[PDB]
Amino acid sequence: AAPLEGRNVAIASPNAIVRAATARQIEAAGGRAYAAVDIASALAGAPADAVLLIDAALSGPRGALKPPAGRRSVVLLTPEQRDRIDRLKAAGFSGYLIKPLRAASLVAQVLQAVTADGVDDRI
Numbered sequence: 001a002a003p004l005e006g007r008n009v010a011i012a013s014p015n016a017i018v019r020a021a022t023a024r025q026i027e028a029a030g031g032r033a034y035a036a037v038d039i040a041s042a043l044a045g046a047p048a049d050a051v052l053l054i055d056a057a058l059s060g061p062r063g064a065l066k067p068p069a070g071r072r073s074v075v076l077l078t079p080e081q082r083d084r085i086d087r088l089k090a091a092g093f094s095g096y097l098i099k100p101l102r103a104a105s106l107v108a109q110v111l112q113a114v115t116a117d118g119v120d121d122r123i
């Protein structure tokens with residue numbers, strides 16, 4: 001009953017209620033939660049192996065949202081924002097979760113999370 005035992009998961013969200021609720025879901029599943037207000041603070045505050053849960057609330061006005069290169073990221077969407085799935089997958093997101101999050105769905109997308117593309121002897 002601890003499917004995230006020994007897993008690190010960051011939650012980047014500008015919303016206090018989403019950061020606290022998602023951190024409580026990560027920890028109840030046996031994971032370690034790293035709460036941050038945005039992508040830069042999630043990269044600075046979370047272990048290098050953490051899966052990044054990134055709130056689509058952090059998108060630009062036209063919906064641009066870049067998952068960090070060489071990291072494993074899942075985007076949090078409203079049901080009305082499902083039209084963005086193809087663009088967010090093309091940007092390098094592993095998958096999506098629909099707000100409000102189901103614990104079982106969070107666990108499955110963290111366990112299956114895949115890397116975005118991207119990341120000397122010559123003196």
Ligand SMILES: Nc1nc2c(ncn2[C@@H]2O[C@@H]3COP(=O)(O)O[C@H]4[C@@H](O)[C@H](n5cnc6c(=O)[nH]c(N)nc65)O[C@@H]4COP(=O)(O)O[C@H]3[C@H]2O)c(=O)[nH]1
Pocket residue numbers: 094095096097098099100101102103105106109
């Ligand atoms: N979340 C997610 N699923 C992916 C992804 N790629 C493929 N799938 C698969 O797509 C199925 C349909 O997902 P949906 O259309 O979002 O349809 C969903 C959605 O309406 C609802 N649902 C699932 N998870 C959540 C959740 O966390 N919150 C809320 N509010 N609804 C959820 O239940 C339906 C059935 O979900 P599943 O049985 O998991 O079945 C999912 C899942 O097995 C991905 O990136 N993310």
Ligand SMILES: Nc1nc2c(ncn2[C@@H]2O[C@@H]3COP(=O)(O)O[C@H]4[C@@H](O)[C@H](n5cnc6c(=O)[nH]c(N)nc65)O[C@@H]4COP(=O)(O)O[C@H]3[C@H]2O)c(=O)[nH]1
Pocket residue numbers: 100101102103104
């Ligand atoms: N298999 C199953 N489990 C159920 C069902 N109803 C409740 N639960 C369980 O009860 C927990 C708490 O439910 P909640 O207070 O409604 O708290 C829920 C609720 O407010 C919301 N939520 C998730 N999916 C939906 C949905 O499809 N519709 C609505 N209206 N709210 C949802 O997200 C919260 C967290 O969801 P969970 O983490 O899944 O946590 C859920 C889940 O473990 C059900 O029909 N089937």
Ligand SMILES: Nc1nc2c(ncn2[C@@H]2O[C@@H]3COP(=O)(O)O[C@H]4[C@@H](O)[C@H](n5cnc6c(=O)[nH]c(N)nc65)O[C@@H]4COP(=O)(O)O[C@H]3[C@H]2O)c(=O)[nH]1
Pocket residue numbers: 102103104
């Ligand atoms: N993880 C999760 N999944 C959710 C949640 N809300 C809805 N779902 C998903 O949506 C399906 C249909 O929910 P329903 O129409 O309320 O249909 C539900 C509902 O009528 C009832 N049910 C099951 N658990 C509860 C519960 O804790 N409270 C209430 N009041 N009804 C429940 O049994 C039906 C069948 O349940 P399921 O086979 O689980 O099928 C559920 C489940 O797969 C949620 O909060 N968390």
